[PDB]
Amino acid sequence: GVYDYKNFGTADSKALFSDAMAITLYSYHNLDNGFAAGYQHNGFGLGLPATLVTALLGGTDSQGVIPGIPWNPDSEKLALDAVKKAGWTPITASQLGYDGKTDARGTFFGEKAGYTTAQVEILGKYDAQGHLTEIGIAFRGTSGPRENLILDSIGDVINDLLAAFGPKDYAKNYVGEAFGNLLNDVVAFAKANGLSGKDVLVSGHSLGGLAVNSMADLSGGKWGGFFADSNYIAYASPTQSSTDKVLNVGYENDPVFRALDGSTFTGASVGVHDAPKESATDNIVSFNDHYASTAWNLLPFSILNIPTWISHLPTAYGDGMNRIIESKFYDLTSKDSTIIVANLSDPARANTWVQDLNRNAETHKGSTFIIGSDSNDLIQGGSGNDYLEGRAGNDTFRDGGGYNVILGGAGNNTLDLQKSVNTFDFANDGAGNLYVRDANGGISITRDIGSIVTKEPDDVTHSVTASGLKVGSNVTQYDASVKGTNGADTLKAHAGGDWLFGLDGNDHLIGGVGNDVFVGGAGNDLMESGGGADTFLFNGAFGQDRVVGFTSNDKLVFLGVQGVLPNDDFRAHASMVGQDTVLKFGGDSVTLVGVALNSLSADGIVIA
Amino acid sequence: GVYDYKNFGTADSKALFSDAMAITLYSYHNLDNGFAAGYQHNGFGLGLPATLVTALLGGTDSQGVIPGIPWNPDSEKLALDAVKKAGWTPITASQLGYDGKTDARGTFFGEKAGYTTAQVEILGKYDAQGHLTEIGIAFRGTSGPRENLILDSIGDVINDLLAAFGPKDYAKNYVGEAFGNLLNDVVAFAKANGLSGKDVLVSGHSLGGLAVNSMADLSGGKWGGFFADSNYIAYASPTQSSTDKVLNVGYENDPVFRALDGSTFTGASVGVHDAPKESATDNIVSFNDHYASTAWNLLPFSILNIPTWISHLPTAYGDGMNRIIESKFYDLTSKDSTIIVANLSDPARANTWVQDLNRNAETHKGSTFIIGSDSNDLIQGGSGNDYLEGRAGNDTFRDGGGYNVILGGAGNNTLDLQKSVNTFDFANDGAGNLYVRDANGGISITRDIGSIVTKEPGFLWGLFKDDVTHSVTASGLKVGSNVTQYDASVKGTNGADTLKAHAGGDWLFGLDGNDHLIGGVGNDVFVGGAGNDLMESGGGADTFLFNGAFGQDRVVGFTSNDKLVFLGVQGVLPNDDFRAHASMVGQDTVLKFGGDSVTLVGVALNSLSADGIVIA
Numbered sequence A: 001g002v003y004d005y006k007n008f009g010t011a012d013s014k015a016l017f018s019d020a021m022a023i024t025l026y027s028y029h030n031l032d033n034g035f036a037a038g039y040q041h042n043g044f045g046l047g048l049p050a051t052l053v054t055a056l057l058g059g060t061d062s063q064g065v066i067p068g069i070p071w072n073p074d075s076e077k078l079a080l081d082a083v084k085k086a087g088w089t090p091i092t093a094s095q096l097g098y099d100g101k102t103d104a105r106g107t108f109f110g111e112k113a114g115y116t117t118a119q120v121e122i123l124g125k126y127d128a129q130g131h132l133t134e135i136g137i138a139f140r141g142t143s144g145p146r147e148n149l150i151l152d153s154i155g156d157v158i159n160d161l162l163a164a165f166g167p168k169d170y171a172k173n174y175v176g177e178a179f180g181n182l183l184n185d186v187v188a189f190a191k192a193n194g195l196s197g198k199d200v201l202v203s204g205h206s207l208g209g210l211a212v213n214s215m216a217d218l219s220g221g222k223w224g225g226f227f228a229d230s231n232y233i234a235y236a237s238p239t240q241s242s243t244d245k246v247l248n249v250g251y252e253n254d255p256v257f258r259a260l261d262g263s264t265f266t267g268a269s270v271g272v273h274d275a276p277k278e279s280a281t282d283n284i285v286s287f288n289d290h291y292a293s294t295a296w297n298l299l300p301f302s303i304l305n306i307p308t309w310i311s312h313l314p315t316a317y318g319d320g321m322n323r324i325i326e327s328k329f330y331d332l333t334s335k336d337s338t339i340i341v342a343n344l345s346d347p348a349r350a351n352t353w354v355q356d357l358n359r360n361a362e363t364h365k366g367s368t369f370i371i372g373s374d375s376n377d378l379i380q381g382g383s384g385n386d387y388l389e390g391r392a393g394n395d396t397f398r399d400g401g402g403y404n405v406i407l408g409g410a411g412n413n414t415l416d417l418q419k420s421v422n423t424f425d426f427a428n429d430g431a432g433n434l435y436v437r438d439a440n441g442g443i444s445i446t447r448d449i450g451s452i453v454t455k456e457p458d459d460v461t462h463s464v465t466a467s468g469l470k471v472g473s474n475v476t477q478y479d480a481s482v483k484g485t486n487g488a489d490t491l492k493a494h495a496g497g498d499w500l501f502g503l504d505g506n507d508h509l510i511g512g513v514g515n516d517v518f519v520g521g522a523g524n525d526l527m528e529s530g531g532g533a534d535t536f537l538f539n540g541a542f543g544q545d546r547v548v549g550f551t552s553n554d555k556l557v558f559l560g561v562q563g564v565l566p567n568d569d570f571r572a573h574a575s576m577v578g579q580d581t582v583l584k585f586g587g588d589s590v591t592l593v594g595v596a597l598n599s600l601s602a603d604g605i606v607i608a
Numbered sequence B: 001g002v003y004d005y006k007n008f009g010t011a012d013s014k015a016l017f018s019d020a021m022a023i024t025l026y027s028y029h030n031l032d033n034g035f036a037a038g039y040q041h042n043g044f045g046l047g048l049p050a051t052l053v054t055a056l057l058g059g060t061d062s063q064g065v066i067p068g069i070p071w072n073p074d075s076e077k078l079a080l081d082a083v084k085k086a087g088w089t090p091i092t093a094s095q096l097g098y099d100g101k102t103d104a105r106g107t108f109f110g111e112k113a114g115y116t117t118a119q120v121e122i123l124g125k126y127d128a129q130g131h132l133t134e135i136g137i138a139f140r141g142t143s144g145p146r147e148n149l150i151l152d153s154i155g156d157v158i159n160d161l162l163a164a165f166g167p168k169d170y171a172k173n174y175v176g177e178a179f180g181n182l183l184n185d186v187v188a189f190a191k192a193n194g195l196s197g198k199d200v201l202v203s204g205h206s207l208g209g210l211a212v213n214s215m216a217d218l219s220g221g222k223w224g225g226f227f228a229d230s231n232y233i234a235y236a237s238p239t240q241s242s243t244d245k246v247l248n249v250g251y252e253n254d255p256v257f258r259a260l261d262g263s264t265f266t267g268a269s270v271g272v273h274d275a276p277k278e279s280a281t282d283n284i285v286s287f288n289d290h291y292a293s294t295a296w297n298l299l300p301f302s303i304l305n306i307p308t309w310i311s312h313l314p315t316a317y318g319d320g321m322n323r324i325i326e327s328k329f330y331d332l333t334s335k336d337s338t339i340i341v342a343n344l345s346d347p348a349r350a351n352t353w354v355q356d357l358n359r360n361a362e363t364h365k366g367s368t369f370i371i372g373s374d375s376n377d378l379i380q381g382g383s384g385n386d387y388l389e390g391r392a393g394n395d396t397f398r399d400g401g402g403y404n405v406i407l408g409g410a411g412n413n414t415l416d417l418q419k420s421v422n423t424f425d426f427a428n429d430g431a432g433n434l435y436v437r438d439a440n441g442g443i444s445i446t447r448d449i450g451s452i453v454t455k456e457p458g459f460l461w462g463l464f465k466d467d468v469t470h471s472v473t474a475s476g477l478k479v480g481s482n483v484t485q486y487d488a489s490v491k492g493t494n495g496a497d498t499l500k501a502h503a504g505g506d507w508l509f510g511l512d513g514n515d516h517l518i519g520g521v522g523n524d525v526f527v528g529g530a531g532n533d534l535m536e537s538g539g540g541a542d543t544f545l546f547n548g549a550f551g552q553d554r555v556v557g558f559t560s561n562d563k564l565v566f567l568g569v570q571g572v573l574p575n576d577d578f579r580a581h582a583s584m585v586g587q588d589t590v591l592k593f594g595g596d597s598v599t600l601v602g603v604a605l606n607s608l609s610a611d612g613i614v615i616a
C-alpha cells in the first residue's frame, strides 16, 4: 500500500495514517474550511473571487479566516468533535505538569524567542477503562489561532524563510528550539502511563510537516532518545529528515511539498521539484481545477505563484487521501504509485475529465490509479494500464487502451468506448465482471457499469445484460464462454475457442485447439492449453495456479495483483522451481509446467 | 516641480499630470474601489481580513472586484463620470472607423494572439463648440473587466513575465503587437480633426505604464512618427523606455515601480530596486500602514511578497499624488525630491507618526517634504530640513531639528516641541508667521499653528515631566497667566520702511515693499520679506532669513560669524549647497534662487563657508 510504514502491516500502516491525518487536521482548527467550501461551490476560474470571499467570511455552512460571524458554523468545535471521533483528546498543560503557554483551546505555543508563533497539539487515545494507550503530537503549519492570525503567520513565515536561508540546521533544530521543554514533559507523562516511544504518533502539515522531520532528526540524541522509535508521518513538508524515520506524504503538484532537498534550497525550489525521494510518496496528483486548467498552467509552476497553493489545502489532503485509504485498489499501491485523486470543484466536475495530465512533474511510470469522488465524475484512463474507481454517483469512464480495471461503484455508471462495438470483444462471467477486449488485445475488467457507449457511423448506448449488450431488443453477443460455479468445476472449451470462467474453488479448465481465454478465478486452478494461441488472466487474490501446455504464442496477463512495483516486468516475479517457471505476486503464483524461464519474453507476459 | 514635463513649465505640467492620472484611473474602472475603502476603514493589520472582504465584495459605499452585488454603488459609472468631469469622453470604434474589438464600455482590446487581454481607452477632450482639442491614450495595467477578471489577469501576467524573461525588447514591442492597427486609426482621426502628436497624452499604470514606455520607444519609427512628440506619463511602470519622452512616476516603496532596468531583470528585480533613474521620480514614499509597520517589514521587501503590493494601488496613486499637486510646497520640489505622502488607514492615522523612515530605499538626500491628509494627522519631521504640510484636520507636528517650514493648514493645529520652552526662542512678524528657533539655531517658520506643546520639569524636582500647551497669541505664548515673550522686534508695513535695531539685537520684519533694515551691534535676525531690501549688519553675529519670492536684496557688513538661511526658496535641487547658487559680480558675491537674489556687498566667494550659508 502507498502508505506502508516501517514493518507495520498494510492494515496497521493505514490505521496510523488515518490518525496522523486526523490530528494534522485538528491542528489547523478548520482555518481552511471556508476556502475548501468556497472552492467546492465556485471553483478557481471565474468564481475564484467568490471562493476567496468564502475563504475569509465562510458562509451558512463554513467558517473562513474571520471569527465571530453568527451565520457561520462553529468549525473549531467541529474540528474538536472530529479529532475525538477519531479517538483523540487534548492532553492539558496540567496533566503534563507543563509551565509554558497554552491558549483557551489547549494549544501549546513555542517556548523561545523566534519560535513563539509555533503551535503544537498534544493528544491522548484512551481505552474503554480510560487508560492512556497512545499519544499524538500534531505540529501546526504556517498560520495561528483566528484571533491573531496575521501577526502569528508573519512569525511563521520568518521561520519558513530561515529553513531555506538561515543556519544550515535551522529546520532540523526547529522542534528542539520551539518545544524542547514541552517534549521533556511528554516523556515523563508517557513513562508515568506505562507508554514508550512506539506509542507516540507524530504528525503535521507544511511547516508542521517540517516539524515532524525536525523531531525525527533530533529523536536519537535529544529527550534521552525516548522518541527514537516513534511514528513520524508528515504532510506537505518542504523538508526531509536525514533519518529513515519519516513517511513524507504529499501531492506532487503541491509546490510546498519537497521544495527543499532535504533541507537545502536549490534552483528547483522555486519551480518543479519532483525528483524521487526515498522518504516520500512521489507520484500523488491532486486533480483540482488549477491542475486541470490549460490557462492556469500558461503560468510557471512555482511556490512563488500563489494560486498553485490550491493543491496545498489541508482539507484537500484529508478528503482526497482518505479516499486513497478507502480505495478498493489500495493494496495494489506502493509508496511511489501514480495516483490521481479527483479533487475538482462542483462546476469543474461537470465538464472536466479526471486524467493523468502528468503536468509539472517527472514522467510517470507503471500503472495508474484514478480515484473518483462520491459525486458524478468523468474519469479518463490513459493508453497504458489503469485502475479507475468511480465510487458513489453516476460515473462515466473513458480509457485509451492497455490493461485496466474499471469499478463503477454505486450509481448508474457508463463506459464510453468512443469507437464501434465491432472493434471489441465482450465476455461476462455471470459473477459481476464484464470483460472488454479491444482490437489490440488490451483487456478491461469492469464491475458495476451497466451502460456501454459506442460510436456507430454517432453515439449508441448498450445495456449490459446476462445475454449480451442490448440496444432495446438488439443483441451484441458475448464471446463463447463456459461459466463455472463457486464450487470446484471441470470446464471444457469447444474447438472454436472459449472464455473459461472458474470462479471460486479449485477448478480444472480444459482448453481446446482454439484460442481460449482462461480465468481460473479465486482458488488453485489447473488450466490446460489444448493448443492455439491462448490468454491466461490473473486478477485479485488468484491463488496458486498451474498452467499446462503454455507455448510461444500464449499470453499471461496479470492485472490487479499483489506486489507489482511501478514498472515491474515478469523477471522481477519469475524463478525456476524444478522444470517449471513460477511467477509470484504476493502470496499468489502461477506455475508454467515444463517451461524454461529463458523461453519467456515480456511481449508474452503482461504485468499491470 | 516634481512632475515638470518637457518645457510645459510648472503650472502646465501639473495640469498635464492631472489629466494623465484621470485617464489612468478610468482605465481600471474603479476595480480597486472596494480595496481602497476597506483599507481606509480597517487598515492592514488586525483589520486585513476585513480589508480583503471589502476588496472582493465592496460595501454600501464601495464596489469590490465582484460585479452585480445589489447593495454596491455603481463604481464603473462613477469612474465614467470622474473621467468626464476631467474633460474626457471615450472615442467610439465608429468615430475611429476601427474594425477590432471593443466591449460595452467602449474599451479597446488587444489585437494579436498573446495580447487579447490588453486593454486601452481612447478618449477625447472637446471645446465649447464641440471640436476635438486633445486625445488621451490610457493603457490598462494587469486586470480586466469584472466580467472576466481572472482569465484576463492571467493573460496579463503572462505578458508581465515575458517583459522580464522573454524575447529581448518584448516590453518595447508590446504596444506594436497589441494596438498597432488601433493606433493607425487614431493617427487618421487626429489628422482629420486637425490634431498632431503634441495634442496626444499617453498614460496608464503598472503594465499600462510599461505600455506608455513601449509606445514612446516605438513612436519614432511606427505610425509614421506621428506620436514622436506626444505626451508620455507612466505610473508604476516596471520598465523605462530608451527615449527621453517618458515621465516615470511612482512610489519608491511600490515593488512594481522600476522592477526592471529599463527592461532588464537583475538581482535587484526581486528585492529593493531603488537606483536613481533619469526618467523616474525616485524618492516618493507612500506612507501607508504596511510602510509604517515594524511587523510587516520583518519580511523582505520584494515584488514576490504580495502585502508589499498595497503601495501599488491606483487609488493611493490618485489620492496621494493629487495632494502633492495641490501642495503649497509643490513648486519647491523637483523630480527627485524626497516626498512623504500620508497614506494611513483611519485606525493607523490615530496613533502612527508620518515620517521619513527611509525604509527599503537608498539614503534620502536634501530637504524632505511631508504631505498630510485632509484628516487629523501626526506628522514627524526629521533632524535635517523639513517642509510639513498638515492640510485640513487638526494636525500635530513634531520635528527633529534643522530648518523647516510647517504649515498647519485649516483646523486646530499643534506643534509639539517635546522639550522645555526655555530651550527655544519665538518670534512673530504679525503677518501670520511664528518663528521657532531651537538651541542649535535651527529655525522653523510656522503658519496656522495656534498651539505649542512643551515638556517641562515637573514633580519631584524634575523626576516627573509636565506637558504644557501654550496658545500662540499677539503678546507671546500663553498658558493661563504665564506669558512666554517673543524675542525683541521691529515690524514694518507692506509699504517701504526703514527699521532700526536696538543695540541688544532685534528681529527686523520688513514685510512687503523695498525696505531699509539697519542692524545694530547686537545679534539681529533680518527678514527683508517680499520686495528688494537693503539690510546692514551693524556688527554682532547676525542672521538673514530668506523665504518664498524674497526679491533682489542687498546685504552690507556680512562677516565670518554671520549667516544666511534660504528656506522655502526656488530652485533648490536635492542637496544643493551655496556653490551651486553663487558667483562673483564685480566686488560682490551674488546668490541666485529662481528670479530672487541676495548680493553680499563686498564679500569674496572664497571667504564663504557652508557653515554660514544654509540652503534648504
Ligand SMILES: O=[N+]([O-])c1ccc(O)cc1
Pocket: A028, A031, A032, A033, A035, A055, A056, A065, A142, A143, A314
Ligand atoms: O491553512 N491554511 O493554509 C489556510 C487556511 C485558510 C486560508 O484562507 C488560507 C490558508
Ligand SMILES: O=[N+]([O-])c1ccc(O)cc1
Pocket: B028, B031, B032, B033, B035, B055, B056, B065, B142, B143, B313, B314
Ligand atoms: O488593481 N489592482 O491591483 C487591484 C485592485 C483591486 C483589487 O481588489 C485587487 C487588485
Ligand SMILES: [Ca+2]
Pocket: A117, A118, A119, A140, A141, A142, A143, A144, A152, A153, A156
Ligand atoms: Ca503559527
Ligand SMILES: [Ca+2]
Pocket: A276, A277, A278, A279, A280, A281, A282, A335, A336
Ligand atoms: Ca519515493
Ligand SMILES: [Ca+2]
Pocket: A252, A274, A282, A283, A284, A361, A362
Ligand atoms: Ca512525481
Ligand SMILES: [Ca+2]
Pocket: A372, A373, A374, A375, A376, A377, A390, A391, A392, A393, A394, A395
Ligand atoms: Ca463518483
Ligand SMILES: [Ca+2]
Pocket: A381, A382, A383, A384, A385, A386, A399, A400, A401, A402, A403, A404
Ligand atoms: Ca488504460
Ligand SMILES: [Ca+2]
Pocket: A390, A391, A392, A393, A394, A395, A408, A409, A410, A411, A412, A413
Ligand atoms: Ca459510481
Ligand SMILES: [Ca+2]
Pocket: A484, A485, A486, A487, A488, A489, A502, A503, A504, A505, A506, A507
Ligand atoms: Ca469454480
Ligand SMILES: [Ca+2]
Pocket: A502, A503, A504, A505, A506, A507, A520, A521, A522, A523, A524, A525
Ligand atoms: Ca477457481
Ligand SMILES: [Ca+2]
Pocket: A511, A512, A513, A514, A515, A516, A529, A530, A531, A532, A533, A534
Ligand atoms: Ca487453447
Ligand SMILES: [Ca+2]
Pocket: A529, A531, A532, A533, A534, A549, A550, A551, A552, A553, A554
Ligand atoms: Ca499456444
Ligand SMILES: [Ca+2]
Pocket: A520, A521, A522, A523, A524, A525, A542, A543, A544, A545
Ligand atoms: Ca486461481
Ligand SMILES: [Ca+2]
Pocket: B117, B118, B119, B140, B141, B142, B143, B144, B152, B153, B156
Ligand atoms: Ca487585461
Ligand SMILES: [Ca+2]
Pocket: B276, B277, B278, B279, B280, B281, B282, B335, B336
Ligand atoms: Ca530620477
Ligand SMILES: [Ca+2]
Pocket: B252, B274, B282, B283, B284, B361, B362
Ligand atoms: Ca529612492
